[PDB]
Amino acid sequence: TDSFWEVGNYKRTVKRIDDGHRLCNDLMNCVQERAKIEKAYGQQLTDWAKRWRQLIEKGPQYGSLERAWGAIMTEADKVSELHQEVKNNLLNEDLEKVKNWQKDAYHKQIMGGFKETKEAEDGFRKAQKPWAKKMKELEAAKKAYHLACKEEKLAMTREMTEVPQKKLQDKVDKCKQDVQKTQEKYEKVLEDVGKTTPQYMENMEQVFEQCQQFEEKRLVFLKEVLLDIKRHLNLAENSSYIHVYRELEQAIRGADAQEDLRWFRSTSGPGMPMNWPQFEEWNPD
């Protein structure tokens, strides 16, 4: 019933074309929204770090420990930088890649809807035109034949007593002649059909196969954008990402309790210089 081969069902193939352009928008929007997220995460890391740096040194912490604590903001900065890069990449590489591909692939007609869709609809319409026509011709004939066959059954039931009369057998005559004429036309229409079906199928097939090629360029491309995105999202394939954590561990393992204690001593404790009491002659001078 809903077979591609029944009149008009090619439309489902045509509509895939249109769809193809929406899916590009879809994917571009998607990538955009993802970038907005990577960026917000990034920007909030930046804020937090700035703030903590200011707080930390505007506060009482001193020494190597101050530095280790400080070291944590430095990962916040480095990790913020990484997300910004991701955002930048999606936007300047991915979005652009899809935008560029789409505008070269789908050409807008000033009427509206795409030149490519139109081209495909026309081609199918053309391929199916003669064929759709015989179809209408055949059914008419099949029906005429069936009608004739019915009338004859009737005349026959009619002969099977009682009231010159000769007009009745002259009806069963006219009806066997109708069956014949009618059967003949039905058969010839059937024949032209069988004669034009190999060509109908070659024509549909060429159009179909062009549309398949066109969706193939799209799908193969899509698969490629998808890997690109995955490559841009994956911090784990960026050698930098482990550096940020090694560098922090170091800054932290580098802190020394006993180094700081001893600084304090010389800076605010017993380690500081003293002018011990000495005698003073009275000169007022």
Add this chain to the structure above:
Amino acid sequence: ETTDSFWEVGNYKRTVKRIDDGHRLCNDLMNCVQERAKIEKAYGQQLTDWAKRWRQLIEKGPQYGSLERAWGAIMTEADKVSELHQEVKNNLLNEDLEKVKNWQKDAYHKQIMGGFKETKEAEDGFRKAQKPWAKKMKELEAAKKAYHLACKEEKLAMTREMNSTEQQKKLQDKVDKCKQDVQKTQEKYEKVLEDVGKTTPQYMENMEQVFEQCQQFEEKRLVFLKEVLLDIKRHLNLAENSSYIHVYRELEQAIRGADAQEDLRWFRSTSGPGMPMNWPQFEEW
């Protein structure tokens, strides 16, 4: 100038204020951790909304076959990365914030007024150890004045004597007193100078000992803090987590699985020329 030396009276107060500072620092660390946890949570949350959103528009859109799966797979990464930022959030709050919170609670005990019991204990250790030296320090300043002043006066009497060009005897006995006064007060000033010198070593020993108790208390806080900074570091470190890499390994595997020709073959039987057809035949009665 050693006006600020810790060895001057009252100047131990910098070591005392350091105790109070540690509590405050503990608070700062907790505030810092929480705020970072909140950034982790938000990025996670934003990822799950995104994944929800696009999971749905993908389902309802015209994208089908193995490509819909590959595109869809990206929503799974958003979700799993999201789940990983939530573990970072929870480790920070439930292990790290909690660990500092506890330690603080067992180290600083608020008193009724209330300062911290640990501060008061040091204020008093210092008071106690500085008591004799503080005393001897005001015996000296006094002794010194009594001397300076008595010299100043001697010059004065001598001066009237010069300015004199009976009672002239009441003016040279007036130098005679002022000479005895310079003697007696210099003896005092000198005997005190000797005491402070002599008892300087025990002033220092006392002080150095209270200060050592302070150092040890700070040491405990410093060693705690480094253990903590390391804890924060492990919890933040997705760059060396198994599951992080794995989400991208799975993502790549899903994307690579997608196969254009297959999708196309599918489309062809399903909606194309490969679909089943009932071609016209001769039809009876």
